[PDB]
Curated annotation (Swiss-Prot), chains A, B, C:
Subunit structure: The mature envelope protein (Env) consists of a homotrimer of non-covalently associated gp120-gp41 heterodimers. The resulting complex protrudes from the virus surface as a spike. There seems to be as few as 10 spikes on the average virion.
Intracellular or extracellular location(s): Virion membrane; Host cell membrane; Host endosome membrane
Protein name in UniProt: Transmembrane protein gp41
Coiled-coil positions: 6-34
Function: Acts as a class I viral fusion protein. Under the current model, the protein has at least 3 conformational states: pre-fusion native state, pre-hairpin intermediate state, and post-fusion hairpin state. During fusion of viral and target intracellular membranes, the coiled coil regions (heptad repeats) assume a trimer-of-hairpins structure, positioning the fusion peptide in close proximity to the C-terminal region of the ectodomain. The formation of this structure appears to drive apposition and subsequent fusion of viral and target cell membranes.
Highest taxon, organism lineage: Viruses
Part of the full-length chain shown: 628 to 661 of 856
Glycosylation-annotated residues: N10
UniProt topology in membrane: Single-pass type I membrane protein
Amino acid sequence: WMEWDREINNYTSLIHSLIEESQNQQEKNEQELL
Amino acid sequence: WMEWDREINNYTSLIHSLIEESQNQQEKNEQELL
Amino acid sequence: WMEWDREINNYTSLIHSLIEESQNQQEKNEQELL
Amino acid sequence: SGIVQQQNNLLRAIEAQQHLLQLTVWGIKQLQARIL
Amino acid sequence: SGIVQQQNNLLRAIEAQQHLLQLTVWGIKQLQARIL
Amino acid sequence: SGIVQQQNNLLRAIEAQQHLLQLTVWGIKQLQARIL
């Protein structure tokens, strides 16, 4: 269970970064379309 | 646990709507390509 | 619980195939852009 | 086309994951009913 | 535009699923605390 | 390019979530083995 905890936070941090990076590229891509 | 239930249904309803909206835009985008 | 197990593996196999297909189309799409 | 194609592949991946999400919730509520 | 639009729809779907993922983890840790 | 770039970001997000999905299933089966 401690490994599961660390693996759960590890992937949660990568998913947060990718959701945030995507959020930014979504704004940039919408800007480039205009 | 009742809050978890409502939060689980709340996000499930938003995901259903987005999966359905995406399903429609997928058909529209495929049409526009042709 | 045995049905849940089979349904869990069934969807995991479809998700693996789609993640792999997407991985390939990602490389192909990056190639076509260049 | 490859982009529209990739989008389809992503959407199907999300829908597949959504089924998985439902199955894990069913697993959780089942275990919770007996431990709460 | 439809592609950028679809991307937004996909991203929102992933974020929604991420909340669902967090909720199931909360469910699992709750049940684990009492069964471990 | 930004679209192909965003697609990569989405795909990586789905793969990351897939790992999370596997981990929650492992959590569920572990708790189920002891409560069933």
